[PDB]
Structure 1
């Protein structure tokens, strides 16, 4: 008997509830770290979970024993929708199949087809056009940022984008993004522990269910359109490539590529692909308002590398160390997925002298890496310095794992990072920014903190440069 990692003694049913913290799952995990260290077991309701804190511990599991920890566990409030299908929430061979398909696909588009950077560039331009019309007025960029991000996923997945005032677009927008806030509510974190009981009563889970059903409905009726226009020689977008692939194995009643796996993979792409990018952007700008000198510097460097004429492109990034550092530091401080996304182990496992039984849920707490004082002088202060060596060159940092690590690492890292780079720079190229609020009175504490973090809403003006 090697046994489970150390941790508090559970009650039946309640589990470790009486050891948790009212402030949420994260604060709980961090309190428990102080007592039990970087690898402990906490019983969430009746199911035990292994929490990993610190960079070292996270890395040993995810990179070193990469495969043992290649498993994905459920999120209670969304499991009824996903049910183990789609790229995010699938395991074993299904997941292996989907993720291989999902990379390849967005990974090229082809010799005539337009590319993801091209798409993002276009979105950026459309955005700057949109931001001009407001002629320097106070706004709340929340809806715009949700818009540009969803449009990138649409562009990829439906082969079209949507005007920022498109009303039925906006209805679905609103609906879909309300889900994110419900999902990271306190209620949803209680649901995580006790769904087995709360499933019988009204609560956020039902709302989240309806909203995701509505989008699923819309996804499905766009899958139909695509199907009756399918041109097997010029696959326009994601859905097409899938549908063609669905064809191949229509002869195999054991193939993973069917209707259900399609709808939910597309959901998955919006689900994982949209809010975090958007809130990163939103938070970037909040930060640049608190730290004008950074913004100035970012602008100075855009001036030198890109100029005022042409539009930022992706390989401008390798020539813009300070800017890449600011982005990295935005994501780091941002800390938008504090306790990561549930893994499970795929086999009994030895870890630091413990044995973890098959399918036990593992929670890699990325927040504890992003704030690791070994890798970040100043872990709780904004500081592009964390990513710049003495020669103003861009230095990798072991503590920096926002997209997580290993076999499950964010499938959209590439896209995501391009979005951040191109939107940040393209906006900053054409606009100064300002706020009623004085810099040093800009509170940066997140309004809500759950499986995602939300920065405070704030008002900003985008001023002209043209």
Structure 2
């Protein structure tokens, strides 16, 4: 019945995602672009190289759109990230369109992101050009964009309610992306801190949902909760609906989480690379002058006029390889793939590293170089190998939102400040710190000096 691809014999100090990714690439030279690993008896089919990822995720997108299963009695399978089947499908679709300004009133997403870019620059001023770990401030901006989308609220960076939300978020994140040693490093007294925090986040959202239910109005939705509340309205006498209070709560939490950390970390990584490559930062600052000036705030229509800057933002995401193995997929049914027969349910692991760091598409793929996204005349050159957000039907739902944040926030920063390293660029170490899921940048500090020539 099942014929899985070949692989090494089963079962196989502190091991991070980048070490895992490197092992995966070494195994592909032995067995080729598609291979199986077993862990005891649980098999995992690995897809390595662009032709394998495309054929599977894109040309057989439906079959490969499942999500890999611990299970958590936390019971978090009711949103988007952890859901499967019919439920995932409708919730994902609904979320996509709401995130593209459908059903959410007349204020745009861009507007939200631009408002936050202004506050982000205000807070950056308050560090007074003195040495700063940007971790916290860069966390708060994406978190507020999402708060605003889901609840219609943004917060001061000192507000204790906003602080608590982020703390609980960071905690669950740290727990879940712990390194391996075989098995996941974690177990101490941690499974319970997870579940508690989860319960606290879901209650905080449910409290907001109760308020929204009071003033609810088919003609005036203004955020995700209203839009979701009003879809439940139209889905009565269509029992049993996928749209419930339970799944609204789970979906909003998925979006908080997924939306705050990935962008935070990418921004922090982008500042590190800009400190290390000052000639790149200068051409970015030149381009911003020439197209935007220091007068008005950046907008998305500027990007088309700013090829160099566009290549830099692209090259940060390609270089850093934020999620080397994406998140685990699974096949939705039994499927013929090349010469293999993969049973319904089998875990699929996708090597995004093998794509982003392809040595023919991106010669010297280990180096940071904006010309990876420029043609020989200096125009913007897009690439089918740009898959930081994955590909196919499970492509990141906040793809468009994340592109906006990275561009608007990075250009606002660079429009108003120069960046100064305390360590000499020459020596500044930029190797990622070990993490079980993601490429995380090392600690660094810098000063934001308000702008002068």
- Does the 8 Å CA contact 2:4/2:342 hold for their aligned counterparts? yes
1:41 aligns with 2:36: yes
State the distance in 1 between where 2:208 and 2:262 align.
24
Q: Give the TM-score, by structure 1 length.
A: 0.92
- Does the 8 Å CA contact 2:2/2:342 hold for their aligned counterparts? no
- Does the 8 Å CA contact 2:68/2:330 hold for their aligned counterparts? yes
Residue 154 of structure 2: aligned partner: 161
Structure 1 unaligned regions, length at least 5: 11-15, 193-197
| Range with bigger deviation, 291-300 or 168-177 | 168-177
TM-superposed CA distance for 1:262, in Å, is: 0.6
TM-superposed CA distance for 1:114, in Å, is: 1.1
Once the two structures are superposed, the pairs formed by residues 320-335 of structure 1 within 5 Å of their partners are 320-335=306-321
Residue 8 of structure 1: aligned partner: 8
- Does the 8 Å CA contact 1:188/1:204 hold for their aligned counterparts? no
- Does the 8 Å CA contact 2:322/2:439 hold for their aligned counterparts? yes
- Structure 1 residues 292, 368: closer, same or farther in 2, change over 3 A? same
Runs of 4+ in structure 1 over 6 Å off: 20-23
State the distance in 2 between where 1:187 and 1:54 align.
25
State the distance in 1 between where 2:222 and 2:91 align.
19
Residue 446 of structure 2: aligned partner: 460
- Does the 8 Å CA contact 2:4/2:340 hold for their aligned counterparts? yes
| Deviations 1:39-69, CA, capped at 9 Å, x for gaps | 1111134321111111121111111111110
Residue 451 of structure 1: aligned partner: 437
1:425 aligns with 2:438: no
Q: 1:69 aligns with which of 50, 61, 64?
A: 64
TM-superposed CA distance for 1:22, in Å, is: 10
Structure 2 residue matching 1:87: 3-state secondary structure: coil
- Does the 8 Å CA contact 1:50/1:363 hold for their aligned counterparts? yes
- Does the 8 Å CA contact 2:105/2:221 hold for their aligned counterparts? no
Residue 343 of structure 2: aligned partner: 357
1:209 aligns with 2:202: no
- Does the 8 Å CA contact 1:347/1:357 hold for their aligned counterparts? yes
| Range with bigger deviation, 23-32 or 161-170 | 23-32
TM-superposed CA distance for 1:82, in Å, is: 4.2
Once the two structures are superposed, the pairs formed by residues 137-286 of structure 1 within 5 Å of their partners are 137-187=130-180, 190-191=183-184, 202-286=188-272
Once the two structures are superposed, the pairs formed by residues 283-302 of structure 1 within 5 Å of their partners are 283-302=269-288
- Structure 1 residues 249, 352: closer, same or farther in 2, change over 3 A? same
Once the two structures are superposed, the pairs formed by residues 93-172 of structure 1 within 5 Å of their partners are 93-109=86-102, 113-172=106-165
TM-superposed CA distance for 1:34, in Å, is: 3.3
Residue 13 of structure 1: aligned partner: none
| Range with bigger deviation, 214-223 or 423-432 | 214-223
TM-superposed CA distance for 1:123, in Å, is: 0.2
| Range with bigger deviation, 287-296 or 343-352 | 343-352
Structure 1 residue matching 2:35: 3-state secondary structure: strand
Q: Give the TM-score, by structure 2 length.
A: 0.94
State the distance in 1 between where 2:439 and 2:202 align.
25
- Does the 8 Å CA contact 1:82/1:264 hold for their aligned counterparts? no
Structure 2 unaligned regions, length at least 5: none
- Does the 8 Å CA contact 1:86/1:262 hold for their aligned counterparts? yes
- Structure 1 residues 299, 21: closer, same or farther in 2, change over 3 A? closer
| Range with bigger deviation, 362-371 or 100-109 | 100-109
State the distance in 1 between where 2:350 and 2:18 align.
19
TM-superposed CA distance for 1:229, in Å, is: 2.4
State the distance in 1 between where 2:392 and 2:157 align.
36
- Please give the root-mean-square deviation of Cα atoms over the aligned residues, in Å: 2.1
TM-superposed CA distance for 1:348, in Å, is: 1.1
- Structure 1 residues 447, 189: closer, same or farther in 2, change over 3 A? farther
- Structure 1 residues 364, 435: closer, same or farther in 2, change over 3 A? same
Question: How many pairs does the alignment contain?
Answer: 450
Q: 2:327 aligns with which of 341, 346, 350?
A: 341
- Structure 1 residues 82, 368: closer, same or farther in 2, change over 3 A? farther
Residue 372 of structure 1: aligned partner: 358
Structure 2 residue matching 1:89: 3-state secondary structure: coil
Residue 30 of structure 1: aligned partner: 25
- Structure 1 residues 358, 286: closer, same or farther in 2, change over 3 A? same
| Range with bigger deviation, 169-178 or 273-282 | 169-178
Structure 1 residue matching 2:426: 3-state secondary structure: helix
TM-superposed CA distance for 1:191, in Å, is: 3.8
| Range with bigger deviation, 386-395 or 177-186 | 177-186
| Deviations 1:345-369, CA, capped at 9 Å, x for gaps | 1111112211111111101111121
State the distance in 1 between where 2:48 and 2:239 align.
42
